[PDB]
């Protein structure tokens, strides 16, 4: 930042200088003829260096008499502004060593004014890590009375937007020569929105728009003077055609032929992503939709501690998915609503104050089920401290529809990851995976169903003489089938290793994308059948669970009964409480498990933020 | 690159493997009763490993009895090919210290294949840097055929069009058999899609119909039927310049399908991928050793002066009758690939007299053809240039740094497809000046470059009606105020002397206001280029002005072609002292420092009375970088 200001031997030259801003000083033209040194002098507040066009370093020019030399060079710098028009002047003479006197004189007058638009920086560059700096502006999507009104009709929505500075110190007469403007790239202008105050802090009119979809340019007025507050809002999240940066520039204009801008001042804005919250997170608050399932459903949330939410409106986790949006002012959860259409739910009964709305219509066979998210791994060389999404598809070679895969990979803080789930009926991730907490090694553990842990179960069970214990038992009457019918069905065996061979896949593609071992995988036996078509649960799904902590709902599997208890939720047990988890089965054969659905598909859970903030991610 | 294959103790397990790749191999359930040991053993060519899935690193199994645990992993590979459907074969026993014959066994048939598509890597990812690596595709935008642009055919018309493309070897080794069976599929992204095209060979090498298309537009999947065997062969070419809208990857896939589900469906077993980055388009500074010298009625001894010019810096000269400021109309840059590196022509949205030149004379053969048209501006190619290479902000740009023009924030711009093509070449990244205070407004009225044997290689020519002033004040204190300019000129422009130019009151604050606005772009390039005063040059110049406009006094010195040593410099008529222009030897006094020759060109009736100078009407190609951009690491 450095501005050359030429002064004249036959004239004095006028110049407006900004705060800290360097200026060099040179002439027009040769110096006096027989010029062998010069002085030069400076108002109190005027700081004038001496230095070599080679050098880094500065040095107090005022108190010598330096011989001349045309490659050194004067710098001059004013840190505080001004209180009248040419409040100060550098006086540069020039001296021989052939007469006593000056041979000339060289004034210039300078007029300094302090103009800076700052923001809370955590000038023109943002950048990620531990070394971070930048503002991060929210989108505001919720109803605090909002992302859609041209007013601030409301008296905490301004706790959800970021502030903005514009320091304007100086004379006031400078300004009826100069001209303040504050403006935005049009992009970025229907990207956010921007409100001045005037009536500070007390009325909602206060605060009128005046950055918006139209207007890219405001003449800021100097309402309070030395300072200007102004209030930003985010309009829209990362997508494939938005990088997620907003610029807002501040100019001082020489007001002939035009305004001709002197100085420019920037603030860089970075939109804050949408990050989702897996199952390992402490929950918050359960939500469900004959149903003897709210019962239980309510006395495990009792026992694990959340609230919960009944609605008669007729899967409730495949509609909507709870994430958050965080900033150092305020961080809210916001929700993303699925393409399936509950589809009034979300935007009806989900919006409350500190609660924002995303959806991406496609204006359709993937729902909010099959989106997770893994807990913070390592893999790849490279960290992920929020985890990383994880969604259905095919192999290379029935995907989710593209606005919603470009809105994930554009929040660029948990990369996600495409798994095999085509070959599911309905194709859902909680089908076949889910994560726990664990207290040992990576603070968790992934759940994956096998039809191969279910082979060795009930033949382990088979070789002691219970192969006569029958599945499906303890049901309203659908078939009762017993071990021995089970394994000697030859298409069945088939096809479940079919299944096995799929789950296998996904198994070795989220050790390699996660970076987890086999000491970390929890195989969970599940059968599965077909209607000459895809999969789908033969027994309801174990691995399709609600997680709240230390308290996990698990589908009642009601298989084969061996000492009056059924030996699949033994071996749950066997399975999760080494884990010291505890595991409440619920009585899911009624409601939910012959409509392809289980505990985890028919309730949501929002859950408490990640510790470790965004910025630091270091994509 | 794992793959998990469980095999079955009441049946055999049959099963297609890929060379290389490692198959983990564990049972459904099972697990004989006793079992307390197990044995594993392989076909020849078949490579058994024994690892726990908690400590990486292998062993070999098939020479001891292991003790049975489920925390163990058994790993096949197979580098090999098969000759047969299933030539290899890994049995499991498994074994008790009960009864001495085995519980039971398991039985696995493997069939390997040796598929995989690879090209020149100088496979999933490209990487900047000294340690990078990936195939680099050109875009071929030339007419290589003497028959007719070569980019929008869809045969190969030519024997050496080829040349320019990238080879694509595509390895399918194994059992004929097998693929009676199993299908290979050739595929791309639709968008990647409409980005290039592939060809692939039938006959190879002879005939120009042997190249069939089959990726483009329309095809995103083909079938390769394996003529040549084991190995067929594609050439692929690019068809589109990075931009705003193309980020420059181009990336082909090779699938194998077990189609042996005749009713079902086919089923992906193993996928590979060749990743290629479209080679971006390079600009060259005067810095450069020059090549040939482009020239463009009532013309006069100044063609004479360029061709006496080249004929001393050795470089071709093209004459060009065609008018109804060759500089303003192309700029000359190349791409480069480690095949084939051939200069590629850029053409100007400025059109109207040399609008068809480049795509009729300068299309040779190996010599490309980039133009984005609009849907406007005052600027134009004579405002393209570009610096040497240099070091700034912190970061190194070894091939230098784009420069072009435009105003502070407050209009005149270069159109936005232009900004977004040169934007986008991420190689050379441009730096906007202020040059809207010019009448026409081009970068080479007040910038230049020159080559300087000491210093940082170079040095930054900027006019300066400040040196014009310390020239004739200096010049009028030995009494020589009386000098006229313009005296050895054709006249009706009114011959002026020193004391009437220095006593003008309007014109020297004028031309302090200019000085003013290249101060500004001094500071600027000193900032963006990480120049300092030692590499810069004031040559004096001033400016006229019809109340809104700028143009040369007289004859603009920094608007001169410089071809390595040999510069040529407008001759400015200045005010004549001994016999000679001061102003020419104040030019002199500058430059020949440097070691170059100064040779100033009569050019006063047909350019500057246009607004131009020599650099705006003659144009010059360049010896490219020896710096290869894929280093760059942007
Ligand atoms: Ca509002
Ligand atoms: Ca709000
Ligand atoms: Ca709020
Ligand atoms: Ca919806
Ligand atoms: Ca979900
Ligand atoms: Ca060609
Ligand atoms: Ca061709
Ligand atoms: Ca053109
Ligand atoms: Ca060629
Ligand atoms: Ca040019
Ligand atoms: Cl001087
Ligand atoms: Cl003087
Ligand atoms: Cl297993
Ligand atoms: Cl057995």
């Given at each position: 930042?450095?501005?050359?200001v030429?002064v004249?031997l036959?004239?004095?030259?006028?110049?407006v200088?900004?705060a800290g801003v360097?200026t060099?000083?040179?002439?027009?033209?040769?110096?006096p003829e027989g010029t062998?040194?010069?002085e030069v002098?400076?108002?109190?507040?005027?700081?004038?260096?001496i230095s070599?066009?080679?050098?880094?370093?500065?040095?107090?020019?005022?108190?010598?008499?330096?011989?001349f030399?045309?490659?050194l060079?004067?710098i001059?710098?004013m840190?505080?502004?001004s209180?009248?028009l040419?409040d100060?002047?550098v006086?540069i003479?020039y001296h021989?060593?052939h007469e006593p006197?000056?041979l000339?004189?060289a004034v210039?007058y300078?007029?300094?004014?302090?103009?800076?638009?700052?923001?809370?920086?955590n000038k023109?560059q943002?950048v990620?890590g531990?070394?971070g700096?930048?503002?991060?502006?929210?989108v505001?999507?919720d109803?605090?009375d909002?992302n859609?009104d041209?007013?601030?009709?409301?008296?905490?929505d301004?706790?959800?937007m970021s502030?903005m500075?514009?320091?304007?110190?100086?004379?006031?007469a400078?300004?009826?020569?100069h001209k303040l403007?504050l403006h935005?790239?049009?992009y970025d202008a229907?990207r956010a929105?921007?409100?001045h105050?005037c009536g500070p802090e007390?009325?909602?009119?206060?605060?009128r728009?005046?950055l918006?979809q139209?207007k890219?340019?405001?003449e800021?007025?100097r309402?309070?003077?030395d300072?200007?507050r102004?209030?930003?809002?985010?309009?829209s999240?990362?997508?494939?055609?938005?990088t997620?940066?907003?610029?807002f520039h501040?100019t001082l204009?020489?007001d002939?032929?035009?305004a001709?801008?002197?100085?420019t001042?920037?603030?860089?804005?970075?939109?804050?992503?949408?990050?989702?919250?897996?199952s390992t997170?402490?929950?918050?608050?359960?939500?469900v939709?004959?149903?003897?399932?709210?019962?239980?459903?309510?006395?495990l949330?009792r026992?694990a501690?959340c609230?919960?939410?009944?609605?008669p409106?007729?899967?409730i986790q495949?509609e909507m998915?709870?994430?958050?949006?965080?900033?150092?002012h305020?961080?809210?959860p916001?929700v993303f609503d699925s393409?399936?259409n509950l589809q009034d739910?979300?935007?009806?009964?989900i919006?409350?104050?500190?609660?924002?709305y995303v959806?991406?219509?496609?204006?359709?066979?993937?729902?909010?089920?099959?989106?997770?998210?893994?807990?913070?791994?390592?893999?790849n060389?490279?960290?992920?401290?929020?985890?990383?999404?994880?969604?259905?598809?095919?192999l290379?070679?029935r995907?989710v529809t593209?606005v919603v895969?470009?809105?994930?990979?554009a929040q660029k803080v948990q990369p996600?990851?495409?798994?095999?789930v085509?070959?599911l009926?309905?194709?859902?991730?909680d089908?076949?995976?889910?994560?726990?907490?664990a207290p040992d090694?990576?603070g968790?553990?992934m759940?994956l169903?096998?039809?191969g842990?279910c082979?060795?179960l009930f033949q382990?069970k088979?070789?002691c003489?219970?192969?006569r214990?029958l599945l499906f038992?303890?049901?309203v009457?659908?078939?009762?089938?017993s071990?021995?019918?089970?394994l000697?069905?030859?298409?069945?065996?088939?096809?479940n290793?079919?299944?096995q061979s799929?789950?296998?896949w996904?198994?070795e593609?989220?050790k390699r994308e996660?970076?987890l071992?086999?000491?970390?995988?929890?195989?969970?036996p599940?059968?599965f059948?077909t209607?000459?078509?895809?999969?789908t649960?033969?027994?309801?799904?174990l691995?399709?669970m609600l997680?709240?902590?230390?308290?996990?709902?698990?589908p009642?599997?009601?298989?084969?009964?061996?000492?009056?208890?059924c030996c699949l939720?033994?071996?749950?047990?066997?399975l999760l409480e080494?884990?010291?988890?505890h595991c409440?089965?619920?009585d899911?054969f009624?409601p939910?498990?012959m409509?392809?659905?289980e505990?985890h598909?028919?309730?949501?859970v929002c859950?408490?933020?990640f510790?470790?903030k965004?910025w630091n991610?270091?994509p």
């Amino acid at each position: 930042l450095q501005r050359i200001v030429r002064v004249s031997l036959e004239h004095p030259t006028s110049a407006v200088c900004v705060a800290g801003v360097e200026t060099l000083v040179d002439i027009y033209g040769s110096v006096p003829e027989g010029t062998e040194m010069f002085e030069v002098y400076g108002t109190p507040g005027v700081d004038i260096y001496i230095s070599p066009n080679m050098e880094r370093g500065r040095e107090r020019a005022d108190t010598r008499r330096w011989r001349f030399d045309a490659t050194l060079e004067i710098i001059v710098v004013m840190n505080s502004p001004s209180n009248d028009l040419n409040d100060s002047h550098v006086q540069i003479s020039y001296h021989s060593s052939h007469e006593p006197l000056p041979l000339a004189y060289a004034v210039l007058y300078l007029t300094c004014v302090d103009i800076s638009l700052d923001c809370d920086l955590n000038k023109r560059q943002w950048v990620w890590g531990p070394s971070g700096y930048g503002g991060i502006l929210l989108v505001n999507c919720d109803r605090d009375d909002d992302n859609c009104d041209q007013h601030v009709h409301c008296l905490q929505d301004l706790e959800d937007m970021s502030v903005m500075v514009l320091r304007t110190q100086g004379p006031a007469a400078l300004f009826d020569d100069h001209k303040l403007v504050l403006h935005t790239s049009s992009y970025d202008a229907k990207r956010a929105q921007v409100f001045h105050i005037c009536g500070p802090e007390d009325v909602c009119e206060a605060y009128r728009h005046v950055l918006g979809q139209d207007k890219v340019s405001y003449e800021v007025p100097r309402l309070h003077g030395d300072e200007e507050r102004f209030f930003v809002e985010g309009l829209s999240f990362p997508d494939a055609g938005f990088t997620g940066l907003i610029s807002f520039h501040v100019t001082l204009l020489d007001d002939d032929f035009s305004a001709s801008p002197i100085f420019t001042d920037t603030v860089v804005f970075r939109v804050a992503p949408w990050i989702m919250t897996p199952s390992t997170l402490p929950p918050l608050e359960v939500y469900v939709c004959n149903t003897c399932f709210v019962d239980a459903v309510a006395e495990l949330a009792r026992k694990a501690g959340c609230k919960l939410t009944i609605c008669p409106q007729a899967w409730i986790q495949d509609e909507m998915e709870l994430g958050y949006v965080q900033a150092p002012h305020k961080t809210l959860p916001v929700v993303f609503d699925s393409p399936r259409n509950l589809q009034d739910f979300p935007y009806k009964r989900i919006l409350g104050p500190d609660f924002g709305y995303v959806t991406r219509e496609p204006r359709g066979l993937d729902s909010f089920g099959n989106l997770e998210v893994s807990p913070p791994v390592v893999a790849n060389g490279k960290e992920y401290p929020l985890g990383r999404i994880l969604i259905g598809g095919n192999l290379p070679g029935r995907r989710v529809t593209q606005v919603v895969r470009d809105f994930l990979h554009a929040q660029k803080v948990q990369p996600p990851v495409e798994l095999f789930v085509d070959w599911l009926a309905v194709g859902h991730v909680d089908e076949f995976l889910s994560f726990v907490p664990a207290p040992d090694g990576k603070g968790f553990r992934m759940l994956l169903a096998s039809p191969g842990a279910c082979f060795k179960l009930f033949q382990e069970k088979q070789k002691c003489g219970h192969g006569r214990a029958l599945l499906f038992q303890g049901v309203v009457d659908v078939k009762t089938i017993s071990i021995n019918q089970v394994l000697s069905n030859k298409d069945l065996i088939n096809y479940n290793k079919f299944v096995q061979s799929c789950i296998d896949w996904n198994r070795e593609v989220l050790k390699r994308e996660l970076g987890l071992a086999e000491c970390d995988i929890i195989d969970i036996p599940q059968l599965f059948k077909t209607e000459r078509k895809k999969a789908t649960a033969f027994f309801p799904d174990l691995v399709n669970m609600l997680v709240l902590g230390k308290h996990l709902g698990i589908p009642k599997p009601f298989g084969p009964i061996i000492n009056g208890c059924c030996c699949l939720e033994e071996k749950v047990r066997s399975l999760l409480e080494p884990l010291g988890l505890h595991c409440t089965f619920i009585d899911d054969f009624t409601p939910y498990h012959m409509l392809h659905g289980e505990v985890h598909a028919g309730t949501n859970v929002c859950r408490k933020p990640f510790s470790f903030k965004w910025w630091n991610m270091v994509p």
